[PDB]
Design an enzyme around this catalytic site. Sequence first.
Site, short mmCIF file in Angstrom:
data_model
loop_
_atom_site.label_atom_id
_atom_site.label_comp_id
_atom_site.label_asym_id
_atom_site.label_seq_id
_atom_site.Cartn_x
_atom_site.Cartn_y
_atom_site.Cartn_z
N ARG A 1 -35.98 9.66 -32.83
CA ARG A 1 -36.18 9.65 -31.39
C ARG A 1 -37.51 10.35 -31.16
O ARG A 1 -37.65 11.53 -31.48
CB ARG A 1 -35.04 10.35 -30.65
CG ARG A 1 -35.37 10.69 -29.21
CD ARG A 1 -35.33 9.45 -28.33
NE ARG A 1 -35.46 9.78 -26.92
CZ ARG A 1 -36.59 9.67 -26.22
NH1 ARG A 1 -37.69 9.22 -26.80
NH2 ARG A 1 -36.62 10.01 -24.94
N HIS B 1 -41.04 14.25 -27.79
CA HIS B 1 -41.11 14.05 -26.35
C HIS B 1 -40.69 15.33 -25.63
O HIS B 1 -40.24 16.30 -26.25
CB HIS B 1 -40.23 12.88 -25.92
CG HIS B 1 -38.76 13.19 -25.96
ND1 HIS B 1 -38.00 13.02 -27.09
CD2 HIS B 1 -37.93 13.67 -25.01
CE1 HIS B 1 -36.76 13.37 -26.84
NE2 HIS B 1 -36.68 13.77 -25.58
N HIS C 1 -39.40 16.64 -21.24
CA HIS C 1 -39.11 16.22 -19.88
C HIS C 1 -38.92 17.44 -18.99
O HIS C 1 -38.70 18.56 -19.46
CB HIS C 1 -37.86 15.32 -19.82
CG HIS C 1 -36.82 15.65 -20.85
ND1 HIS C 1 -36.15 16.85 -20.87
CD2 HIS C 1 -36.34 14.92 -21.88
CE1 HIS C 1 -35.30 16.85 -21.88
NE2 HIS C 1 -35.39 15.69 -22.51
N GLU D 1 -31.91 19.71 -21.54
CA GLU D 1 -31.10 18.89 -22.42
C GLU D 1 -29.94 19.69 -23.01
O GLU D 1 -30.13 20.78 -23.55
CB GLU D 1 -31.94 18.33 -23.57
CG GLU D 1 -32.28 16.87 -23.45
CD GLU D 1 -32.52 16.23 -24.80
OE1 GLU D 1 -31.72 16.47 -25.72
OE2 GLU D 1 -33.52 15.50 -24.94
N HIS E 1 -39.37 18.39 -28.25
CA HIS E 1 -38.47 18.31 -29.39
C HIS E 1 -38.50 16.90 -29.97
O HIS E 1 -38.98 15.95 -29.35
CB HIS E 1 -37.04 18.67 -28.98
CG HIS E 1 -36.58 18.00 -27.73
ND1 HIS E 1 -36.92 18.46 -26.47
CD2 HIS E 1 -35.85 16.88 -27.53
CE1 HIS E 1 -36.40 17.66 -25.56
NE2 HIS E 1 -35.74 16.70 -26.17
N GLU F 1 -33.88 7.87 -19.39
CA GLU F 1 -34.50 7.88 -20.71
C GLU F 1 -35.83 7.13 -20.72
O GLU F 1 -36.72 7.45 -21.52
CB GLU F 1 -33.56 7.25 -21.73
CG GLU F 1 -32.64 8.20 -22.45
CD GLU F 1 -33.37 9.24 -23.27
OE1 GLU F 1 -32.82 10.35 -23.42
OE2 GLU F 1 -34.48 8.95 -23.75
N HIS G 1 -6.04 22.99 -11.50
CA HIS G 1 -7.03 24.05 -11.50
C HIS G 1 -8.25 23.59 -10.72
O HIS G 1 -8.37 22.43 -10.34
CB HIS G 1 -7.44 24.42 -12.93
CG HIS G 1 -8.25 23.37 -13.61
ND1 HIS G 1 -7.72 22.17 -14.04
CD2 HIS G 1 -9.57 23.33 -13.92
CE1 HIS G 1 -8.67 21.45 -14.60
NE2 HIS G 1 -9.80 22.13 -14.54
N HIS H 1 -12.78 24.68 -10.35
CA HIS H 1 -13.91 25.49 -10.75
C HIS H 1 -14.62 25.99 -9.51
O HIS H 1 -15.15 25.18 -8.72
CB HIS H 1 -14.86 24.68 -11.64
CG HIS H 1 -14.18 24.03 -12.80
ND1 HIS H 1 -14.06 24.64 -14.03
CD2 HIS H 1 -13.57 22.83 -12.92
CE1 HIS H 1 -13.42 23.84 -14.86
NE2 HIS H 1 -13.11 22.73 -14.21
N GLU I 1 -18.07 19.29 -11.64
CA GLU I 1 -17.74 19.09 -13.05
C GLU I 1 -18.06 17.66 -13.47
O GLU I 1 -17.81 16.71 -12.72
CB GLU I 1 -16.26 19.40 -13.31
CG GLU I 1 -15.75 18.92 -14.66
CD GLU I 1 -14.29 19.27 -14.86
OE1 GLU I 1 -13.80 20.19 -14.18
OE2 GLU I 1 -13.63 18.63 -15.71
MN LIG Z 1 -11.88 21.03 -14.72
#
Ligand SMILES: [Mn+2]
Lengths: 338, 338, 338, 338, 338, 338
Positions: free
Chosen positions: B57, B60, B62, B66, B105, B127, B238, B240, B245
């Site tokens: 790859r 490059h 950005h 990442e 990287h 990409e 639950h 967060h 997420e």
């Molecule tokens: Mn969760």
Amino acid sequence: VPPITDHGTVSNLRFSFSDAHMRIEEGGWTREVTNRELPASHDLAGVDMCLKPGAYRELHWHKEAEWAFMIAGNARVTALDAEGRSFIDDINAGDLWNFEAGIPHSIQALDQGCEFLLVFSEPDFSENNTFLLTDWLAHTPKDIIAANFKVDESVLANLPGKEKYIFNGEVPGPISEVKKNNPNGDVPSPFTFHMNDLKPHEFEAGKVWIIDSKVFPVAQTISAAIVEIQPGGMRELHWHPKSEEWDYFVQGHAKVGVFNSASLARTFNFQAGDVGVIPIVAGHYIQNIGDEPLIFLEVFKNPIYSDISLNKWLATSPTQMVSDHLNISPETVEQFPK
Amino acid sequence: VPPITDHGTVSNLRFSFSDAHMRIEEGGWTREVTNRELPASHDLAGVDMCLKPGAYRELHWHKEAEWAFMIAGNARVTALDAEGRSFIDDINAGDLWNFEAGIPHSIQALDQGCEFLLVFSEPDFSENNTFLLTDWLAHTPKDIIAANFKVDESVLANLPGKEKYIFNGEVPGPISEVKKNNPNGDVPSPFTFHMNDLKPHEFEAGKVWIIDSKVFPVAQTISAAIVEIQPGGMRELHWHPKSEEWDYFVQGHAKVGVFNSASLARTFNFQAGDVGVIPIVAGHYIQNIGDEPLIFLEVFKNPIYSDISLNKWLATSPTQMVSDHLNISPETVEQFPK
Amino acid sequence: VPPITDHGTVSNLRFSFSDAHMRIEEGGWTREVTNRELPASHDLAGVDMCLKPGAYRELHWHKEAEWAFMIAGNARVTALDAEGRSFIDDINAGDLWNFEAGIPHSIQALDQGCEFLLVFSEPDFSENNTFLLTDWLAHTPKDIIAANFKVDESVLANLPGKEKYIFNGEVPGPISEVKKNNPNGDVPSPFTFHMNDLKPHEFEAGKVWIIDSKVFPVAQTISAAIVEIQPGGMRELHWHPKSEEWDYFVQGHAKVGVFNSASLARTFNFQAGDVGVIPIVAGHYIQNIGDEPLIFLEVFKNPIYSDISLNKWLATSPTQMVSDHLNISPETVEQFPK
Amino acid sequence: VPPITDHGTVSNLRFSFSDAHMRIEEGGWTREVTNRELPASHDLAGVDMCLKPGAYRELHWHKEAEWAFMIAGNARVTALDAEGRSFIDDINAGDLWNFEAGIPHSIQALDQGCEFLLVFSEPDFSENNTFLLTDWLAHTPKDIIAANFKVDESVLANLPGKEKYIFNGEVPGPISEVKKNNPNGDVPSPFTFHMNDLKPHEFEAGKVWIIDSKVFPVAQTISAAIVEIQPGGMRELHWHPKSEEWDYFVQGHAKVGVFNSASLARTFNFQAGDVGVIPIVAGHYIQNIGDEPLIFLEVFKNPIYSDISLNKWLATSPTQMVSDHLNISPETVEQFPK
Amino acid sequence: VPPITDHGTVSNLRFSFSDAHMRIEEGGWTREVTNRELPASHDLAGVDMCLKPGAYRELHWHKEAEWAFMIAGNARVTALDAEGRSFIDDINAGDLWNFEAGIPHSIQALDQGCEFLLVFSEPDFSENNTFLLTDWLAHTPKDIIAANFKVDESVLANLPGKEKYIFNGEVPGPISEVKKNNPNGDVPSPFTFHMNDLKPHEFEAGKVWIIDSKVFPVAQTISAAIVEIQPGGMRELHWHPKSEEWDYFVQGHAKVGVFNSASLARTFNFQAGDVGVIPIVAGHYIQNIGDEPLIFLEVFKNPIYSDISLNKWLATSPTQMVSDHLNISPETVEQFPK
Amino acid sequence: VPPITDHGTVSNLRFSFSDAHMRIEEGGWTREVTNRELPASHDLAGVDMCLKPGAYRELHWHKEAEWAFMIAGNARVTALDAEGRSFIDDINAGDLWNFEAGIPHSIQALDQGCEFLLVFSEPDFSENNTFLLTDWLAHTPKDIIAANFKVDESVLANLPGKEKYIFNGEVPGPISEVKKNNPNGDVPSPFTFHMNDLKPHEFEAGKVWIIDSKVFPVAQTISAAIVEIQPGGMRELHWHPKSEEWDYFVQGHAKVGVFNSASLARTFNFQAGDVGVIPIVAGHYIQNIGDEPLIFLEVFKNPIYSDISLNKWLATSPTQMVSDHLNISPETVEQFPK
Ligand SMILES: [Mn+2]
Ligand SMILES: [Mn+2]
Ligand SMILES: [Mn+2]
Ligand SMILES: [Mn+2]
Ligand SMILES: [Mn+2]
Ligand SMILES: [Mn+2]
Ligand SMILES: [Mn+2]
Ligand SMILES: [Mn+2]
Ligand SMILES: [Mn+2]
Ligand SMILES: [Mn+2]
């Protein structure tokens, strides 16, 4: 004639202060380059200001942070911090000052007069929208101002009914002769940076002074690099990993190449009055194309200066990889600068 | 057939990597899921990439950060940080890497080839809009490149005139043989995380490996939890408290129910290769509804992982209060897991 | 009839809680002032809530942070943090509480009933769009809830099929007899602030208590100053350098003068029920124009309180400078308060 | 496996109704594809609705204009225009209707039941936020409704306290038995279009029915083309000069290729029940890749249909020009279809 | 040195085409002025394009509308409308053309070469973001193109795999022998405007050609005024009630004064390569300050030309009113021009 | 105490002119209600203006359209259209005027004095941001103005150096003795509407004057309905299918109920000075709850007035449908008003 390598649509990245409107006042003049002149700028805006000897930049404050490079002359600045601590200093050409958001301050030219560059932490800043002391009091009821000052209203009969902004005054005395007593003392770290106190990293074609928060502790919003490059030299191919770059060219002539992603490339010619912009993480170079040293400031909305050089990137990458990338022999890769 | 408990307008939260357009190149392929495919995503974007044995790859960088989860195979990564220190490592399936914003990287598959998931710190990442080494040099004047490398222009005749992105290569030698000396040394904390080093938090229905900045110090922008839930199990209700997420489903079949505010509820079925999103602080559950262990990544644009479970909340809340809320007797409320 | 020194277009800065729509429920009532009522408010929104003795504010959470000032009565708060540690406390008029983003909590009035003000970290907050326990459970499949609690679904026959929001209950017992056991223990720093623990900064016409993160460690998002001004008194001319200001008047009558930039000024009359906003770094004064003590809250979306007084600013400024600015002699300038 | 001629970042342009949440009610079901599922759609949104024999879609209205294509079955629709004029009609598979912004209407399936596709003139529409008659009255004070209807409040005793949306009914009688008298009379032009009244444009591979405002005078906001393409046929390379295109694939399998500018190209496979989007003035083709006739609707937020064919463009272009462009001899250019 | 009558912050309104980046091709060059150069431009964008004798501007289309002024030389244009009708014509310096949104067209210089100005109906247009015939065919599968043209794939072997944009050709023959037979015929009204067919409105300081939809029927989106002002002349004080003004100065030197609202006023110096913008309803004047006639284009995104002259406004107003306003005697008001 | 049927989050829809800042000028006063006071208003903004007998509202123009209702007194207006045709007329209470975008105009109170309501076609309007004749000329160089008027600069010695806005003047003579001669003549249709020329449609509890473009041809941007409702009467349940509604209450006390979609409903009390907003297609009623007739203006940014009444909708729908909808008997449905 642009290079054969330019391609695609890149915004204009250059604007000359000489194309900016000139607000002329007795005691000085002011002009600005903002995102209304250069929409590619998303973080910073610049103001070029000049004060005749002894002239005031009126007491004021603003929502944005101020970062200043002293172009020429000498001046005195005063300020007050949020904890009631005061600051006062004199500076000469090449020095900086810095007022974070909402910190009130003053500037007065000394015997030499002054010209300086100010950088503000919003791209849409305007000098005609700063919070001025005389404007403030001109729009506060006189009974209220009297109650505040704990005096009678008649004493305030001659308060201005209109701002002064930039006005003439006499060159003040020495600091020790004018400094007023403050039981809170002075601010713990100066709002000013004296440039001989720093010595520059030297590279092949010139010098670089790096002034960020690690050098100038109060400068928590804007950082900069003052670059001087001798004729025939060049600021090598590199990019800044964290922020857009905002440039002011102090002296000289430069060729500037910018590569955004996606086959986008543009080249500009810059000279001593110009503001430039490099998009975020965009790869760029700055080559001296004049006979005098090229001096400019790279300024960033970032407390920490950081950059990445292409030569260093290739020097640390496995040689077979760089060779497979560039279609050049490993032996010839091995001789690139390290 | 949705549950009768669903109600209101909830965005779609599911998109399959198999429904993304596949960029195929000599030596590998890539496909992405972003807010152009899953607009409920406001923080992160996902890329599924595949490299043939020895394939690169391209080097490059950005603007975005990442985070990578290694799906299959082995690979080598190299990078350089902002202070000039270099990084090189090999990783296997289950391992991670992390490159903060603007850190350049390269990736090269080793003998097994590799497939990996990349997650980016902006929802509109692509990409096809990455800063590529060969693209950069293809759009830089050759006299400029020569002066930079301090070589003659003729040496650079066979430089690519067009990007490579993903191209074939030979499986490299050992790091002990290929590593270059760098007077700045190695990066102080690895850009790599070997998942055998980590022990999981174990509950009744499965295990959770939590990798955040307290575990993976360079990962200051994106953190994650690898969740494995056995057949018949469930990720209990639950939420967060700090962030949206973003999920990638590695293996298994799941039923995921999400409750936004204001009587809004939607239920989705996920399977391997699906990307999902749970809105910020939305209450949700993830039930294994298949024969095999369900493996997925909860990923967050947040340096610290955090969540809050319903049962714990009720167990710590006064029993009469829970009883008045739920119209259930104090005795059975006392029966809930704690 | 507005003062002669007002000028220009300044947005409305005043909105009465008596003009806000009143949601009445079994056990209490609620009303809010947001940017749907006061568009000049860009950071915070206000909620006025009243609970009958023993009445519940339903167990809930939200994306935003809560800062609360207790207007009258007494109440109990419960909460749970991200590390599983619980909190429970009782508070009286004048006390505060604080739940950062996503921290679940409940409020229940004690013997007296209670009225309190809530301030939220987004200007577009809504009391009708919070995450309610019963709303959540009414929109979750009963098999899922049964598995979550691992009870049989028969126990859940009486779960509400609809929110409760604010509902009646019995005044609960003492904390010591009702508090539930938590092996993780209590939160390390209270989500509560009892105002009898803090001495006010006193100046000539009144007192101000300053509560920010240096006094109230959990409050990392919202800070405040409770100001009490005697009849004939005034909050001296000042501005806040870092933030917008959001005011709730508790009691009294005030005249508030605001100076935005560019000669923009407006004067408002504020009253016991009123919410106000002062634009960022805007210069302002607040004068008591009633015969009862004026009490109000200055609140900010900022962990640290900061202000700058005009008197101190001129006090630390060179006398010739202040005189050149204001067209008054050094002698009378030397007479300003310091 | 995408064509080698694909390139660049193009948004996802395909979404299957089978991936949309199905709101199921007594008497029917509904599901929608909007910019929350396909953000590349900026003009229109789609609804797939199914009604059991005699079932009502509740009397309702909305801000958006709706265009409807009847997939299967039969139905009766009623509506009212702004001049107090009423409309009633029955329709079969293949027929259309159109309600401009704010025009209230109802739908009731007849003996066969019905499925129909609705198109709405905003990309963010959703069926769950339409103005329902019963919802309206359920949230109006009963004294107000009583005075309005000029009746006393107890007949309103069994008014629904909650919407119906889709509910069961008996197949109604004939219109000539059911029509209510209106002194303002019928609307001058039907809100309905019977497709047997329209001649299709015949081309090489198939048929095109074009229904825009010149054909369906009330449809001043949305226009459409019903396209049927024989096996082995193709919708030739073309673009629409004025607006985005929104597709519904009724039957068959298609390969759709889209070329935006700047070397951006993406290819998708569509099947029955899929919604697609072609960006504005984007060039595209639609090839049948199944054995069954490919039927789909091209829909546009535009009162007039227009398109431009590549073959026509080349045939009307000077032959030397087409040749100089394509590097094909005039001999061959003269042989393209015209 | 600006006039004292200037005041306040007005955006930059001037940008020189000579400061715009130049795209150079075999056979011509291009440069543009857009809101990436002139952010005060909210309606239109400018392109200055020049073609060598016989050179093509490639067959293309765009989502925006094109209005073109012929600066020098001669050229041939071809186009096709939505009804399949064709257009072909030649033009000389001073003539116009117009292609509404999506109307496909080509331009080819004749024996002289050509220079022309293009104005587009969006401010963010880009010449590098146009829909090109060869770009399209280079990104369409060859099997698809073969089916479309009804030829076998061997014929399409020499199709460009890359755009041409601007490329060289032979000066073509007469329209009469090169025009292709279109069974649909010509477009009903030309996409071209030959300026000798139009007589200018004459005022004592110069001439004005007004070209809008009543004179140039196809131009339903952009209209213009070509103004010529003699030395010592002036375009009198006026404004346009409905639109922004977009200026291109063909020849001469001008001083342009602009008055936005609220005491905002700025003055600029314009010359041959310059683009200007006058904000909506802003009052402005244009003074010739050179020795040669001043020729420029006022262009508007508005099908109808409109302006309001200050002199006429005052002349039609009661003299007691005008005198009361301007503190001038009535008799002097009576001698202003009318 | 709001109705039991109110529910959900609705914007504030009410703001009183008595809460707006009042700019006082010798000769009159002005105050405005815009989206800085009422953010729910997206189309229109209101100004309440009062002029002393003979006082001028300075000659001016603006980007937005003016629609004005005469509250009390009498006044004179002058204007000029884009075709050079002039207008002058005098008006009394109950009459209207209308100046489209950019049309310059004047207002002068007559013997009675005057108060009027102005409505502007943008929600963010401000009277202090209007284009004033004296402001324009005070910020125009006097050499330029002298050349413009073809006079000597000496003549322009007493031009104001500052706007006048609202200033005193003498009540002028009759129109026939003051009107200035214009070779273009008068405008073809008046910019004024005399309300004695319009018969109101009479319903049971009151009267409605409907003024739109079919009644008032120059009013192509704003239309209105003046509603008078007797005590105990009510404006029946209805909605406007095409636009938001903007209300100004001339006289009385009203209860207004608003139903947006999705179970959203809120009720407000309006009185003699209040501005209200009804969202687009929202269903609403207005009931008189005072002892005098309720007079108000419903105003719309729409050239055509339209509404749809619930009673008419139900009367024209098949009775079995309405009965199945409302759970009411067919006979009781058939007795609803028609
Ligand atoms: Mn969760
Ligand atoms: Mn400053
Ligand atoms: Mn740099
Ligand atoms: Mn809360
Ligand atoms: Mn304050
Ligand atoms: Mn409908
Ligand atoms: Mn098409
Ligand atoms: Mn073109
Ligand atoms: Mn003009
Ligand atoms: Mn209405």
